[PDB]
Design a protein around this ligand. Structure first.
Ligand SMILES: *[C@@H]1O[C@H](CO)[C@@H](O)[C@H](O)[C@H]1NC(C)=O
Lengths: 173, 54
């Protein structure tokens, strides 16, 4: 939520993207297509598995304790045993509620973050050859075939190759 | 209780090494036949009616 990409300038997610969490959709003179971006998806996954690693399969061993159920009324000593346990139970219960709320807040935001980074990286690659249409898409001001699109995704796009072409198109009257 | 009006009260005593158990009695003693070993560790007790599984 906090970076404003996911549930923000990105209108919605793509349910048809099933081979990654982030990716690219393009349209050009040869058609329109889709490809997942592996590195950003993995970055998000890696952070979430880290949380799970702290939380899953990490329980504490306890053995002989105090009794916690009672068949007879006893008063002072029994009140304390019960109170000790209730107090304990309430505090563990607090940490967990807080933990989940906090973890969940950080996860949506970190995932929002990863989407934004990929956008920003993409934005920089295109230099002056594209403009941000404001909804996460770039209008690219030059002929850009599948190989061209592939180069952007693959991080090997050479802005110098297309710059003259793009500038003429951007700055037309 | 089970047709018995009398009772026995149970007590316990721990004796350290170098120490000595002394019993002085003039009646009504229900005598120990010996001692239990006492250990320390991870053992406990739980009240439950759940079946034991393999
Ligand atoms: C990225 O482009 C380079 C240059 O052609 C190529 O060697 C490589 O296979 C490409 N990477 C992917 C995963 O498409």
């Amino acid at each position: 939520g906090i970076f404003g990409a996911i549930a923000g300038f990105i209108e919605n997610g793509w349910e048809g993207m099933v081979d990654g969490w982030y990716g690219f959709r393009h349209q050009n003179s040869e058609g329109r297509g889709q490809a997942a971006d592996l590195k950003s998806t993995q970055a998000a996954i890696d952070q979430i598995n880290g949380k799970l690693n702290r939380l899953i399969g990490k329980t504490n061993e306890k053995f002989h304790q105090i009794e916690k159920e009672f068949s007879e009324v006893e008063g002072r000593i029994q009140d304390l045993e019960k109170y000790v346990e209730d107090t304990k139970i309430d505090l563990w219960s607090y940490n967990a509620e807080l933990l989940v709320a906090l973890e969940n807040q950080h996860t949506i935001d970190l995932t929002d973050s990863e989407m934004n980074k990929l956008f920003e990286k993409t934005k920089k690659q295109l230099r002056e050859n594209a403009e941000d249409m404001g909804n996460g898409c770039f209008k690219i001001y030059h002929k850009c075939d599948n190989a061209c699109i592939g180069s952007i995704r693959n991080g090997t796009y050479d802005h110098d190759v297309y710059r003259d072409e793009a500038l003429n198109n951007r700055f037309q009257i | 209780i089970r047709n018995i009006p009398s009772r026995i009260s149970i007590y316990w005593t721990i004796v350290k090494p170098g120490d000595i158990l002394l019993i002085n009695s003039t009646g009504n003693l229900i005598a120990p036949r010996g001692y239990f070993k006492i250990r320390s560790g991870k053992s406990s007790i739980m009240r439950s009616d759940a079946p034991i599984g393999k």
